[PDB]
Amino acid sequence: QRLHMLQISYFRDPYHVWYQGNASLGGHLTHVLEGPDTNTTIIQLQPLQEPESWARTQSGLQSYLLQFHGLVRLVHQERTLAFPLTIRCFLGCELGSRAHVFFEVAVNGSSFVSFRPERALWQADTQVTSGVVTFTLQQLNAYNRTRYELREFLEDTCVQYVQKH
Amino acid sequence: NTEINNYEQWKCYYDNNNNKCKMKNKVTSFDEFFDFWVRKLLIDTIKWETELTYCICNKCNKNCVCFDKWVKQKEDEWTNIMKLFTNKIPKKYYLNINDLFDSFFFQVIYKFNEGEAKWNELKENLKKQIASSSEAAIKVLFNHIKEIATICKDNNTNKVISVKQIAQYYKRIAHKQLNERGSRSALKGDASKGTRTKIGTPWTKIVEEVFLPPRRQHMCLAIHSLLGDVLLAAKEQANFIKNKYDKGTICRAIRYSYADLGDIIKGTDLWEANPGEKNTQRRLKTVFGIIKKMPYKLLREDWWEANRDQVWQAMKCAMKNGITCGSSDHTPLDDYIPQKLRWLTEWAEWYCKAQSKEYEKLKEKAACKKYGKNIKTWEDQWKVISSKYKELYKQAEIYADKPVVDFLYNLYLQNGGTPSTVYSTPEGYIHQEAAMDCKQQHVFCDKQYAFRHQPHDY
């Protein structure tokens, strides 16, 4: 059917973040995420994924969270970011032709940015472009890691999970 | 309560919060300080490796040494940061290399054109070092920048192009070939993982035609075991010369013995006639074979190249006699000068010491039936030496013994090769490369002739 993944990152400090999140397969909770950047635990509630695959998945997710944090730190360093800062990322894939994918990020509840795989580009959702919004999109559209490797996650890895379970 | 070294200086505090660090007066949390320092360490590392890539003519010796000074400064700052914790520290600061890069990915690639490439190449190089050796990324990085600083310093080593300049050419080729094989990360060892006298005497003449210095006669995990044995021998020879053997004399003797030791290990030495030397050379063939199963000379050339700084530092032990004369990392190029050249240079130095020793007896024409005869004995050795040099030099002329002919023609090509400037004549060779202590008999070319019976003054 689909995957709807959600995380909320509460940054009390650029260098201090509390993560909380989850993922639903179709309409039901399958995964949870919780803890600080130094001790975030990612749990599959429904142990359907092989332990090895799952360990690889957790590694990829932890890599993501560290890179995510690094992006927030860089945005705050280059462009001032007020704290406490809450980042809410909603991403997913939906399946009977080619899969639909999306990724949108809100800041303090206000949709801040989104991904459009058709050109492998990120664009603002917000009608108000400011230094933070422009700078964040740059990193997104300057590196293959944020433009194409993300598509493999959303249009391939995400959908394989959905198709399989 | 620690201070972290026309630059910034900081005073840091740390708790089990107000665990701040202070630089007008910038005050940040410790975590911010740590992050600042680390991202700068990584950015600066990439810029340095990139800038030095073309050398990793004297312009990069100055830049290369600056890099090594930079590396040492950063290592001390790192130690001072660790003093805040004093407990052999959570992952918040103990990033794994994969963690460090994943965490600092955006901050560092942000500063570079094709930054993802540089960020990757650095990750791969650090992973390769730890794989050879879940350790902290910062420690692995420090080891990486120290290896580069050493490798670079070797390349520079601080009308006529000298033998030392040509030796540098062969040194640069050596590492080049090593870099292409890529084995140094495997061959460089770690010591912690391991276990005649008279001047007036002519040199021994050996055919089965080379004259053997009295200095050479008086010579003292297979990789880690080998490096430990080599370092020990190197240390012993340095102490042997220092304690049992002039400044120029003590320095040249230690430095030439270092080069001779490299020849022994490489298996390119001339003195193969001696059975003790043969026993040693067979042991080397055995150990390197063991090393290969990764005369073995080509691998040995790499292993010695992968382990020449370790051997040289071993020879600087327990002394206040600076030997740091014209080299960077105080490491000489003598192991890249064909042994026949260094021994020649050396023969002339011993000869002029012999001439002065005999000369000095003519103080307070009966006594000149010893001097001018002892002189004749040494004069004959030069004849042999001069003739062989000329044969090899002429082969080099036509080309422009293989390592000497190739050394000479490349030296000749850079010295007029199309008349030769100063190296076509072996007397001329000595007058450019060696230092003569002789008195009133200062000219090897045939009044003040080096081998005259009685000095023009006496």
Ligand SMILES: CCCCCCCCCCCCCCCCCCCC(=O)O[C@H](COC(=O)CCCCCCCCCCCCCC)COP(=O)(O)OCCN
């Ligand atoms: C088969 C299993 C399927 C998953 C099942 C569900 C698992 C539980 C999930 C719990 C909820 C967490 C939701 C948060 C998202 C997690 C997924 C991250 C996906 C992702 O971005 O890519 C990974 C990291 O790589 C990258 O390098 C790209 C990241 C770069 C950062 C992108 C920008 C972040 C948003 C902008 C914030 C700006 C804020 C500024 C104030 C790829 O991992 P992989 O190695 O396996 O590769 C595979 C092919 N590429």
Ligand SMILES: *[C@@H]1O[C@H](CO)[C@@H](O)[C@H](O)[C@H]1NC(C)=O
């Ligand atoms: C990580 O969180 C678990 C609870 O989810 C706790 O028991 C553990 O002690 C924490 N570890 C660290 C290093 O904080």
